């Protein structure tokens, strides 16, 4: 994942490339 991860993600947070936000995790 890119640097806008590194965490969790709920609803639709990461949308960076390489990032997404797979409910409830950034990846």
Same mark, same amino acid.
């Given at each position: =994942?890119?640097? =806008? *991860?590194?965490? +969790? *993600?709920? %609803?639709? %947070? $990461? &949308? +960076? /490339?390489? *990032?997404? $936000? =797979? &409910? /409830?995790? *950034? %990846?």
């Amino acid at each position: =994942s890119a640097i =806008s *991860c590194g965490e +969790t *993600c709920f %609803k639709f %947070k $990461c &949308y +960076t /490339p390489r *990032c997404s $936000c =797979s &409910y /409830p995790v *950034c %990846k």
